DNA sequence: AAACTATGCATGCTCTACTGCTTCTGATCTAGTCGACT
């Protein structure tokens, strides 16, 4: 007896770990809205690898996911509160 | 002394093979578009 269930594996270094976790934990709509807000309001580009500033060509790496929200001037939300 | 035949040379045509140069074809590869997923 056995059943087929899909599984997805993704790898990322420790430096890019918080960004990957944020991008792969939140909902699709939440990620879209966060990326749109980052691009429009603050002018920064957010993706699964890191946060980039077109003006200054320097990455905004961080050691935790809380810092990612803190940089964007946004109140932190737990994963359970990111549903859409 | 005369006729036949052995021996050789010069040349054109043809099969057969071999070496080298050039060109064509089969095989090994990056850009554009659509689509899948997350």
């Amino acid at each position: 007896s056995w059943k087929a269930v899909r599984v997805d594996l993704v790898v990322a270094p420790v430096s890019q770990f918080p960004f990957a976790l944020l991008g792969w934990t939140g909902s699709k709509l939440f990620q879209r809205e966060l990326r749109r807000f980052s691009r429009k309001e603050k002018g920064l580009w957010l993706n699964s690898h890191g946060l980039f500033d077109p003006e200054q060509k320097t990455f905004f790496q961080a050691a935790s996911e809380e810092d990612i929200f803190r940089h964007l001037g946004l109140e932190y939300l737990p994963p359970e509160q990111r549903n859409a």
Side-chain angles (χ1 to χ4, degrees):
Chain A
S1 195
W2 44 262
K3 91 190 286 211
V5 288
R6 319 192 334 96
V7 187
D8 294 354
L9 298 317
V10 171
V11 183
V14 70
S15 202
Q16 308 176 12
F17 179 61
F19 296 102
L21 203 75
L22 173 59
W24 289 87
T25 190
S27 178
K28 177 164 153 276
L29 192 76
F30 186 95
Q31 284 303 299
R32 282 162 81 156
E33 294 294 76
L34 175 51
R35 278 150 195 204
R36 195 188 96 211
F37 168 86
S38 87
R39 162 154 290 200
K40 250 70 164 172
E41 266 51 32
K42 284 292 181 333
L44 319 177
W45 301 353
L46 181 63
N47 79 309
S48 316
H49 301 327
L51 186 73
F52 164 72
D53 195 335
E55 297 145 291
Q56 297 81 241
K57 307 283 182 61
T58 62
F59 274 26
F60 287 59
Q61 40 59 42
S64 188
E65 163 285 353
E66 212 97 339
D67 312 302
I68 310 312
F69 272 95
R70 195 273 316 292
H71 270 178
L72 282 171
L74 247 174
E75 55 267 352
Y76 164 71
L77 321 173
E80 314 105 38
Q81 296 278 32
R82 299 208 261 264
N83 287 252

